[PDB]
Structure formats: structure tokens, C-alpha cells
Design an enzyme around this catalytic site. Structure first.
Site, short mmCIF file in Angstrom:
data_model
loop_
_atom_site.label_atom_id
_atom_site.label_comp_id
_atom_site.label_asym_id
_atom_site.label_seq_id
_atom_site.Cartn_x
_atom_site.Cartn_y
_atom_site.Cartn_z
N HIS A 1 -10.78 15.28 -7.53
CA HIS A 1 -12.19 15.42 -7.21
C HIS A 1 -12.55 14.50 -6.10
CE1 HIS A 1 -11.85 12.40 -10.37
NE2 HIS A 1 -13.00 11.87 -9.94
N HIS B 1 -9.19 12.20 -5.09
CA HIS B 1 -8.41 11.32 -5.94
C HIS B 1 -8.31 11.90 -7.32
CE1 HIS B 1 -12.54 10.32 -6.88
NE2 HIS B 1 -12.15 9.78 -8.03
N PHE C 1 -16.54 9.54 -0.61
CA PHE C 1 -15.24 9.06 -1.12
C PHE C 1 -14.32 10.24 -1.18
CE2 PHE C 1 -12.59 7.31 -4.70
CZ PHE C 1 -12.31 6.09 -4.15
N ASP D 1 -8.52 10.17 -11.23
CA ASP D 1 -9.02 8.94 -11.86
C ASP D 1 -7.86 8.10 -12.44
OD1 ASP D 1 -11.55 9.55 -11.16
OD2 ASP D 1 -12.26 9.82 -13.20
N1 LIG Z 1 -13.17 -1.69 -10.61
C1 LIG Z 1 -12.93 -0.74 -11.76
C2 LIG Z 1 -12.14 0.46 -11.28
C3 LIG Z 1 -12.83 1.27 -10.19
C4 LIG Z 1 -11.85 2.37 -9.73
C5 LIG Z 1 -12.50 3.15 -8.64
O1 LIG Z 1 -12.77 2.67 -7.55
N2 LIG Z 1 -12.77 4.44 -8.90
C6 LIG Z 1 -13.46 5.25 -7.93
C7 LIG Z 1 -13.09 6.70 -8.20
S1 LIG Z 1 -13.48 7.22 -9.93
C8 LIG Z 1 -14.96 5.04 -7.95
O2 LIG Z 1 -15.49 4.23 -8.74
N3 LIG Z 1 -15.66 5.72 -7.08
C9 LIG Z 1 -17.12 5.69 -7.02
C10 LIG Z 1 -17.65 7.12 -7.26
O3 LIG Z 1 -16.81 7.97 -7.61
O4 LIG Z 1 -18.85 7.31 -7.11
C11 LIG Z 1 -17.75 5.11 -5.76
C12 LIG Z 1 -17.60 3.58 -5.79
F1 LIG Z 1 -16.42 3.10 -5.99
F2 LIG Z 1 -18.09 3.00 -4.68
F3 LIG Z 1 -18.32 3.07 -6.84
C13 LIG Z 1 -17.10 5.64 -4.48
F4 LIG Z 1 -16.98 6.92 -4.59
F5 LIG Z 1 -17.96 5.36 -3.48
F6 LIG Z 1 -15.99 5.06 -4.16
C14 LIG Z 1 -12.14 -1.47 -12.82
O5 LIG Z 1 -11.70 -2.62 -12.54
O6 LIG Z 1 -11.93 -0.88 -13.90
FE LIG Z 2 -13.27 9.67 -9.90
#
Ligand SMILES: N[C@@H](CCCC(=O)N[C@@H](CS)C(=O)N[C@H](C(=O)O)C(C(F)(F)F)C(F)(F)F)C(=O)O
Ligand SMILES: [Fe+3]
EC number: 1.21.3.1
Length: 329
Positions: A268, A212, A209, A214
Site C-alpha cells: 500500500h 511498502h 509515502f 507493513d
Molecule cells: N516508529 C515506529 C515504526 C514506524 C514504521 C513506519 O514508518 N511505518 C510507516 C508505514 S506503515 C508509517 O508510519 N507511515 C506513515 C503513514 O503511513 O501515514 C507516515 C509517517 F511515517 F510519517 F507517519 C508516512 F506515510 F508519512 F510515512 C516504531 O518504532 O514502532
Molecule cells: Fe503502512
């Protein structure tokens, strides 16, 4: 090689008690970490993370393809138009390795006034069948409240750190209305690992990923003991050491907004690692109508030239933006 990022371990246990000077000394540590790389590990947090990881593993390894469609968010299942946030986020074998299950406030029940109003970002959680996953819903809902309690304590530390009274953020972080979410993320071991599911950074690093900030006030994260995160610093991207006993804490962009970037939301990214592992974030989100007036702890009068932004507007726009930037997860 990549240098190791400075990610201090902070004993946060005084934030649960009533020794005010001790809480101030924890707040200073949070301030220092927030001003440096933007990450720290909360230790002595009181949560049974080993049991969290075991119950999550049992869920991830037993859920079936049939169940995943039945719980899927709208992005994977057009029948589920109300599921924008909560539910199952499927892998696409050969293309997308990661998969996950998101749930929101357990108090968002069909009778909740924001559910009745169909206010954006509020949804009723979906769960697998109890007979197939005995105990899972109850465990997961209790976990929500255990990590809500840790987050409340951490928010007292951030408030003190910023020169505010300890309830400055926590008064907007309430059981009946928080938009906070838990995500139970499964990263698989795959042999062969499909190249389509591996991204490449400009510097050549293989990623799951991209970079970004958060979408959160703060993020309170448990991960397996497999190194994968990197934080951008003035000295470049640095590796964040894993620690599966602690919670990794960082600010999100709402904190950056409120503090006029005094506490930045650190950029990150997630390295590609071919390992079976877990990432279990709790995104500390306020209520839909929560508005804190932005300020600046580097300015004598504390004033900021940022305008107030409600948390619900922030969140709905941030989640869309992150999908557009880095792809549907
Ligand atoms: N669906 C959640 C919000 C999720 C927001 C999001 O996608 N954040 C990313 C960056 S912190 C995230 O969850 N990334 C994960 C990670 O950092 O490990 C994963 C994944 F999304 F798949 F779970 C990845 F990096 F792969 F995207 C909500 O509704 O609150
Ligand atoms: Fe994150």
C-alpha cells in the site's frame, strides 16, 4: 479514475465474547478479506475513537517547537542516542510535511529487565511536561491498553481463520513484553504545499509515502475521514475508502512469513492530500523472543519451507529496512 478497493466492514464484537460459532463466522470474514485485498474495517470495536482524535488533536496543535526538540528521536537530535523508536519525529518545513509522536509499551520502565539489558527495540517512553499537556500521558497510555485489547481480540479471529486455536498469536502478545507501538501522525494543511514534500509514483500519482509492506504482525489503524490510502491488487492500485468510525486492519510481513504468504502483507501507499488530518496506527508486534513456527494452510501437512524468525530480529531489521527504502519519517 482509480477503482475502489474491496474493504469489507466486519463486526468484530463476537471476538470479545464466548460464543464460539459466532467467532468462527467472524474468522471466516477475516479469512476472506485477508485472501482478497488484504484490508478490512473492524466495526463494533468498542473504542471511543472520537475522543482519541480529540485528545490527539489537542496534543498536536499545542506542542511547541521547543518541546519537539526536547522529545526528538535520534534522527533529529543527536543528544538522544537511546531514542531510536520512541519520541517526536519532526517536520522539516519546505521539505517534509508530516510529523509524529511514537510511544511504546508503558511497561517498558527503567526497571524492566529488557530496558536494564539495553535490548534493541526496547526504550522508555518520553513524554511532554504534564503542566503543558494535562492528561495527555495518562490518556495515551490508556489508549495503548484499549487498542491492545482490540488487537488481542482480532488476533483471536486471525488464529481461528488459519485453523488454529484462538490463542495461537495472542499467547505471544502480552502486556509485560509486547513491542507494539502507537504513532500519532499529523498531516498538515499547507498553503502553498511544498513540492519537495510531495513524491511522485511511477504511475504519476502524487504521494506522501511510497509503496511498502507493513512491519508488523497486523496493523490496527484509525484515520480521519479523508481518503488517502491505496492498495495494490492484481487489478492495480485501488483506493481504500476512509471510515473514521472503524479501524482499518491489515497484515504485516511477519504474518506473511508465518503463513507462507497465504495471508499476504498487502502493498500500500499514501496519496498526497492537502488536508489537516490524523493517522493513528497501532503496530501489533510480539515479544522480542517470540518465535512462531511457520506453516502453510494451503498444504495438506501444513508444512512450510520457511525458517523460524524471532520477532525481535524481524522488527529491528524491518524498521531499518523501511527507513532505507522509503526515507526517515
Ligand atoms: N516508529 C515506529 C515504526 C514506524 C514504521 C513506519 O514508518 N511505518 C510507516 C508505514 S506503515 C508509517 O508510519 N507511515 C506513515 C503513514 O503511513 O501515514 C507516515 C509517517 F511515517 F510519517 F507517519 C508516512 F506515510 F508519512 F510515512 C516504531 O518504532 O514502532
Ligand atoms: Fe503502512
Amino acid at each position: 479514475s482509480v477503482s475502489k478497493a474491496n474493504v469489507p466492514k466486519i463486526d468484530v464484537s463476537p471476538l470479545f465474547g464466548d460464543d464460539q460459532a459466532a467467532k468462527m463466522r467472524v474468522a471466516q470474514q477475516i479469512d476472506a478479506a485477508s485472501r482478497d485485498t488484504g484490508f478490512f474495517y473492524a466495526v463494533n470495536h468498542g473504542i471511543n475513537v472520537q475522543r482519541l482524535s480529540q485528545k490527539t488533536k489537542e496534543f498536536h496543535m499545542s506542542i511547541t517547537p521547543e518541546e519537539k526538540w526536547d522529545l526528538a528521536i535520534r534522527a533529529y537530535n543527536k543528544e538522544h542516542q537511546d531514542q531510536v523508536r520512541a519520541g517526536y519525529y519532526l517536520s522539516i518545513p519546505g521539505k517534509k510535511a508530516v510529523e509524529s509522536f511514537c510511544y511504546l509499551n508503558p511497561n517498558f520502565t527503567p526497571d524492566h529487565p529488557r530496558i536494564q539489558a539495553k535490548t534493541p527495540t526496547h526504550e522508555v517512553n518520553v513524554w511532554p511536561d504534564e503542566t503543558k499537556h494535562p492528561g495527555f500521558q495518562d490518556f495515551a497510555e490508556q489508549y495503548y491498553w484499549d487498542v491492545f485489547g482490540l488487537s488481542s481480540a482480532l488476533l483471536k479471529g486471525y488464529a481461528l481463520a488459519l485453523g488454529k486455536e484462538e490463542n495461537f498469536f495472542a499467547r505471544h502478545f502480552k502486556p509485560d513484553d509486547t513491542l507494539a507501538s502507537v504513532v500519532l501522525i499529523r498531516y498538515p494543511y499547507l498553503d502553498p504545499y511544498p513540492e519537495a514534500a510531495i513524491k511522485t509514483a511511477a504511475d504519476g500519482t502524487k504521494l506522501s509515502f511510497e509503496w511498502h509492506e507493513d512491519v508488523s504482525l497486523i496493523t490496527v489503524l484509525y484515520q480521519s475521514n479523508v481518503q488517502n490510502l491505496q492498495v495494490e491488487t492484481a487489478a492495480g492500485y485501488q483506493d481504500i475508502e476512509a471510515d473514521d468510525t472503524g479501524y482499518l486492519i491489515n497484515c504485516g510481513s511477519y504474518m506473511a512469513h508465518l503463513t507462507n504468504n497465504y495471508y499476504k502483507a498487502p502493498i500500500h501507499r499514501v496519496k498526497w492530500v492537502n488536508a489537516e488530518r490524523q493517522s493513528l496506527p497501532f503496530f501489533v508486534n510480539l515479544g522480542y523472543d517470540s518465535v512462531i513456527d511457520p506453516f502453510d494452510p494451503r498444504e495438506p501437512n501444513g508444512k512450510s519451507d520457511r525458517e523460524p524468525l524471532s520477532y525481535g530480529d524481524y522488527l529491528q531489521n524491518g524498521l531499518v529496512s523501511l527507513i532505507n527504502k522509503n526515507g526517515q519519517t
